[PDB]
Design a protein around this ligand. Structure first.
Ligand SMILES: [Mg+2]
Ligand SMILES: [Mg+2]
Length: 212
DNA sequence: ACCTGTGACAAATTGCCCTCA
DNA sequence: TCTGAGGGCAATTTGTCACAG
DNA sequence: GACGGTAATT
DNA sequence: GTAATTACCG
């Protein structure tokens, strides 16, 4: 049974922009941190490859490029911004990377919490769909169902959606429908929604879900 | 002016393949 | 030989915007 | 490369 | 023929 990720709701609702590969690595960091400290973590290429059904080569490519793409990335808890890394990653041994997570991030990870097993999200491709599945997990009930109304502006400012998704039809076509379809095809969740409006503008999205 | 969706194009990402220390 | 660090790809997805209703 | 199987050399 | 350590090859 795959690793049970838990995280403070403050991270689920933080403002940041990470790729799929970066979020994948981040889940393992959160797992390492929680089992305890000082903040120094490690990643093995071959274990990553086995976890996500990747080759060693493509695993190596994903880790390396995610890792160099962390530089300058920042995290906002609503309104405080932090860098993810305080030192570049580096490899003491072949197939092994050592990373220095900002120790000031530790209390935001382990605290009003969100939890999901890693197999639920490891087939998801779109990172915004990972964000959506995390925010839905934050409201899930023991039995596996839930319902929540999210404000569109808050979705855009938390997930840092790109500017053209401020136009609602592109928001619908390239984010909402794709990430709902992905969740429904790639997780053990079954998700539906309906739109809440005010005048001509759509202001919130109401998600209902149950477990299969 | 506001809303919706679709058609196109560009930019990014994906799972691939190959090569050599 | 088995790893993994590189070097590439075509097909597909994602981000953007012009245009009609 | 890094590691271990296998022949080779004392 | 054996023993055992070793260069090196895959
Ligand atoms: Mg990859
Ligand atoms: Mg999709």
């Amino acid at each position: 049974n795959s690793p049970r990720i838990v995280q403070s709701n403050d991270l689920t609702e933080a403002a940041y922009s990470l790729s799929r590969d970066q979020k994948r690595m981040l889940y393992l960091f959160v797992d390492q941190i929680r089992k305890s400290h000082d903040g120094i973590c490690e990643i093995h290429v071959a274990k990553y490859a086995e976890i996500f059904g990747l080759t060693s080569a493509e695993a190596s490519k994903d880790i390396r490029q995610a890792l160099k793409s962390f530089a300058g990335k920042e995290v906002v808890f609503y309104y405080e911004s932090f860098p993810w890394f305080i030192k570049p990653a580096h490899s003491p041994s072949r197939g092994l990377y050592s990373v220095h997570i900002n120790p000031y991030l530790i209390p935001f990870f382990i605290g009003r919490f969100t939890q999901f097993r890693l197999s639920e999200t490891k087939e998801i491709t779109n990172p915004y769909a990972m964000r959506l599945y995390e925010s839905l997990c934050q409201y899930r009930k023991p039995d596996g169902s839930g319902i929540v109304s999210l404000k569109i502006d808050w979705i855009i400012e938390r997930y840092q959606l790109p500017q053209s998704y401020q136009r609602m039809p592109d928001f619908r076509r390239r984010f909402l429908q794709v990430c709902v379809n992905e969740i429904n095809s790639r997780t053990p969740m079954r998700l539906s929604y309906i739109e809440k409006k005010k005048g001509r503008q759509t202001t919130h999205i109401v998600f209902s879900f149950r477990d299969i």
